[PDB]
Swiss-Prot record, chain A:
GO molecular function: DNA-binding transcription activator activity; DNA-binding transcription factor activity; sequence-specific DNA binding; transcription cis-regulatory region binding
Keywords: Activator, DNA-binding, Quorum sensing, Transcription, Transcription regulation
Claim: Phosphoprotein is one of the keywords in the record: no
Family per record: Belongs to the autoinducer-regulated transcriptional regulatory protein family.
GO biological process, one term: positive regulation of DNA-templated transcription
The keyword tRNA processing is assigned to this record: no
Protein name per Swiss-Prot or TrEMBL: Transcriptional activator protein LasR
Note: LasR in strain PA103 is not active, this is probably due to the change in position 180 of the sequence.
Organism from which the protein derives: Pseudomonas aeruginosa (strain ATCC 15692 / DSM 22644 / CIP 104116 / JCM 14847 / LMG 12228 / 1C / PRS 101 / PAO1)
Function according to Swiss-Prot or TrEMBL: Transcriptional activator of elastase structural gene (LasB). Binds to the PAI autoinducer.
One cellular component (GO) term of this entry: protein-DNA complex
Superkingdom of origin organism: Bacteria
Length: 160, 160
């Protein structure tokens, strides 16, 4: 894990982060961090390899206000898994459908809360054939991801 | 199961459960301390564990919260600090050692609502190399435990 802090700068950190993620089995990741008491996303540090069209669609649709993982992150340090039960309203369900259409079906979101009030999320999606396989996979990797998120937060807050 | 923390009733039961989970991971002495957001003193701290009373009393009376290097580390990072040796810092390590607390680590706690604290755990060992091997062997499980303790503990201390 210390290779993240020991990376040279943004590009090497992003690739190392995305590579640790792929080695664990997640082809898609997004790390997002805001400074303490941020009012909007003008100063957000957001990196990863989510598809561009989905990044753009989520911004244009204002999905930070509907995505249930975002409100979760304001309330907890524990992971939220992407499962049917977290999409309660129709509007959350169609967030779910559009993420799915973009290729992001199975996954989880780890909240980020830094020592200087930084607020963020590390999200990772796994390409699996059904929820049973996705869940099995995530169990096997969860303790390692649990460390990764804090090593990512501490190093990324230093970079950002 | 981490679930038994969230379902406990009252600080006695919670602290017992946490102490047992730690003991199972090889740690005989632990201290969980948590302050509300932007605390200026320790008057509203929630501190539970099985550190010895004489050591707790000494640490407070001697002002060791201003000396102990783990405390400033927690204000600056989410990553753990392993216990490894200023002249007052020299005094601090000697007196901890005299109290039986020689090897261990402190896991900083940064809550979703700005709670600040630490989960400190001591391991009994023949020497530091052996202590290190004992801690490394359980570090992924401890990493999950500290965040479960923080999420449940914040509720117990400040909300329910
Ligand atoms: C206030 O502090 C914050 C808030 C938010 C983010 C943050 O990274 O949010 C974003 C952004 Br910005 C853009 C996209 Br595209 C996606 C997310 C997160 N959601 C999922 O991955 C997700 C979550 C559940 C299901 C599907 C997905 N998905 O996007 O495919 C960071 C810091
Ligand atoms: C940032 O908000 C905070 C700050 C601090 C604590 C916190 O719990 O601090 C305490 C207290 Br209060 C009493 C004692 Br006794 C010990 C500690 C911590 N140090 C060690 O365990 C230690 C650390 C290194 C080596 C040895 C030891 N040891 O005590 O044996 C909680 C919340
Ligand atoms: N990295 C910035 C602080 C920062 C943290 C998180 C997000 C954005 C900025 C300094 O140095």
């Amino acid at each position: 894990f210390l290779e993240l802090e020991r990376s040279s700068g943004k590009l090497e950190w992003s690739a190392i982060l995305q590579k640790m993620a792929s080695d664990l089995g997640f082809s898609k990741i997004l790390f997002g961090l805001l400074p303490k008491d941020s009012q909007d996303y003008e100063n957000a540090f957001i990196v990863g390899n989510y598809p561009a069209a989905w990044r753009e669609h989520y911004d244009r649709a204002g999905y930070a206000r509907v995505d249930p993982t975002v409100s979760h992150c304001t309330q907890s340090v524990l992971p939220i898994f992407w499962e049917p039960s977290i999409y309660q309203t129709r509007k959350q369900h169609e967030f779910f459908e559009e993420a799915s259409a973009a290729g992001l079906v199975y996954g989880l979101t780890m909240p980020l809360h830094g020592a200087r009030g930084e607020l963020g999320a590390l999200s990772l999606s796994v390409e699996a054939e059904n929820r049973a396989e996705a869940n099995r996979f995530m169990e096997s990797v969860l303790p390692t991801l649990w460390m990764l998120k804090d090593y990512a937060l501490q190093s990324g807050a230093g970079l950002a």
